[PDB]
Structures are given as structure tokens and as C-alpha cells.
Amino acid sequence: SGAIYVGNYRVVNRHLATHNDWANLVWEDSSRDLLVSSTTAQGCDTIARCDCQTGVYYCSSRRKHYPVSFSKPSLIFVEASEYYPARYQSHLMLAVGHSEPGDCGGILRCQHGVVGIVSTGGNGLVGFADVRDLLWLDE
């Protein structure tokens, strides 16, 4: 679990969005596993606007942060799950690092701010949904 709170927006994994997220929907994209909902309170986070390929992510299944080298956002095949049919997920960045299903929502940060959230993983990989291209989150 986890979310990014920026301005009057909440960014979550689309597959973990709540009834309240859907009732306050701003934007969603199944191909990216992202959903953004509106909030009444001002957020605590800021978004990176950069091309970093290193950063640190929070891993809830270890209660720890780990450093990672990750690929640029790309279109990657993701096998069928209870949440989606087999498909290509876009804007996904892969890295070597521990992750388990409940780690989705963990934030990846670089020195410039929030880069993205854990969305996929397994077998010593961790995949992050990028948010750096969503310029409207800032205004």
C-alpha cells in the first residue's frame, strides 16, 4: 500500500484504488496502473522533474529503504494477475531489488523529489510506475 500526496491530488496504484478514489476521480490509466483522485487537504510531497536513473525506494515487506538503479520508463510485458489481463504496462521502470505484492505503493525518490511508485515485481526485481511526466500534478 501507499500513495503520493501532492497539492490537491492523491496518486495511487489503480489496482488498489478505493471506492473514495473512484468517487473523486481526476484521471486513471489501466496501461500505467495509475489513478489520481482529488483531496481536500494540501499534500506533503513534491514531484521530481528529471532523468535520474538512481534513487531510493521504500520496501514495506522489509520495513526498509533500498538504493536502486532503474531503467528509463518503457513498455514492459506484465503477466495476467487477479487485477489485469496479460498486457504491456507503459511508463514502467525496472530495477533489481526485493519486492512482494503488498509492496505496491512504496515511493521511489531521487534527490529531486518523488519519481514513482512500486507497481510490479518478483524474483528479485521491482518495477515502478513513473509519475515525472505528469506535469499537471504541480499546478
Ligand X SMILES: Cc1cccc(CC(=O)N2CCC[C@H](C(N)=O)C2)c1
Q: Which positions lie near ligand X, rule CB under 6 A?
A: 15, 33, 78, 81, 83-84, 89, 99-101, 103-104, 118-122
C-alpha cell at 96: 533489481
Rounded to an integer, what is the distance from CA 93 to the centroid of its chain?
10
50 is in an annotated binding site: yes
Residue of minimal CB distance from ligand X? Answer: 121
Give 34 or 114: the residue with its C-beta nearer to ligand X.
34
Strand 74-78 versus strand 87-96 pairing type = antiparallel
Distance CA 130, CA 32 (A): 8
Q: Which of 21, 33, 103, 130 is catalytic?
A: 33
Q: Is 65 a catalytic residue?
A: no
Sign of the torsion angle spanned by Cα atoms 110, 50, 122, 89: positive
Binding-site residue set for Zn(2+): 50, 52, 110, 112
Catalytic residue annotation: 15, 33, 104
